[PDB]
Amino acid sequence: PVEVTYKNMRFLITHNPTNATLNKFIEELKKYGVTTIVRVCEATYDTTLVEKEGIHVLDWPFDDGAPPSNQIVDDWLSLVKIKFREEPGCCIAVHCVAGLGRAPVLVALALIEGGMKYEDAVQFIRQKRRGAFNSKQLLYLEKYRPKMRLRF
Amino acid sequence: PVEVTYKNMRFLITHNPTNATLNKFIEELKKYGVTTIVRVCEATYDTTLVEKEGIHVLDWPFDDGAPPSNQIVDDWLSLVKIKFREEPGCCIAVHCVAGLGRAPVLVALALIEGGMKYEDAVQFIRQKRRGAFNSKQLLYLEKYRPKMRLRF
Incomplete structure (x- = not known):
């Protein structure tokens, strides 16, 4: 359970x-x-129980070692905005x-997208995960050209 | 003759x-x-005379109301770097x-590319040109996604 925050954003990366x-997972997320x-992988649990605690679940899966499309990047980025x-x-x-x-x-x-250079981002995250990002993924982030349309 | 500078860059926009x-044009550019x-338009003057004053001339023309390709954006951006x-x-x-x-x-x-939002850039330039940028061009700049690979 790695937590990372920048500017006015704060994300939790869980298992x-x-x-x-x-039931505890909820109890924690609630905390x-x-x-x-957002589930970027396969869905393996009835969310009706989670939704009842006001915690909406989004399922934007995208193949590993494969860039998360463009529709996901848009929705996600917009969800953050x-x-x-x-x-x-x-x-x-x-x-x-x-x-x-x-x-x-x-x-x-x-x-x-928040104004951090990709390496800056990667480092900032490894600070909390250390094993985060593999070679294929790093490449992705490297060639990513941000829209830079998030005001702060 | 509008001059604009940011960070460690300083450009001159002439006629x-x-x-x-x-001969005077040189005398001035030298000043x-x-x-x-860089000539982004048609070339109408023998540069051999300019080159002799150590002022190399680049000809990267690109159609008006038409985004300056990708090869130009790269070379130009790299020329600035x-x-x-x-x-x-x-x-x-x-x-x-x-x-x-x-x-x-x-x-x-x-x-x-220097870390300025497009509007920020447009405004910063109009400060000196006022009539700079037309509707088609503004659109370009708006959809432009910077590589953000210039260190400062």
Whole structure:
């Protein structure tokens, strides 16, 4: 459970909960004040229970070692533009399945789009994950050209 | 003759010289300390005379109301990355023909690539030109996604 924050954004990168640890997972997400959870991997748990706690779940999966399309980058980036202005001091959670995987990839994106050079972003995240990002993914982030349309 | 500077960059936006005002044009460019002149429009003057004063002339023309390709954006952007580090406090000149035209477009690019939002850049330039940029061009700058690979 790595937490990273920059400017007015604050993300939580967690592990896919088990069908049996789902009640605590909530209890925790609630603690960190997360109001949204984006699953960039396979979905393996009934969310009706999570949604009932006011924590909407988004499913924008994208193949590992494969850049998260363009539709996802847009929606995600836009989700960040709104959510944090919309609900001050809240947290957005992102998770995969085998553990982190590519979650970091979208948070890196928010950071870069947030005016951070890609390396700056990658380093800022490894500060908390250390094993985050693999060679294929680093390449992605390197060639990424930010829209730079997030005001602060 | 509009001069604009940001960080360690300093550009001069001039009018295409006449075959008869070429000697003074030089005398002036020399004053502003320009070491390069990029012609984004038609070429209408023998440069052998300019080159003899150590002022190399580049011809990267690009159609008006049409984005300056990608090869030009790259070379220009790269010319900026080098020249100013290469020769501290120097000036880069850019000109069209009927007057300004799209010169401003590349300087805007250097500014944005220099960490300025497009509007910030456009405003910063209008401060000195006021009539710079037309509707088609503004659109260009708006959709431009900077590489953000210029260190300062």
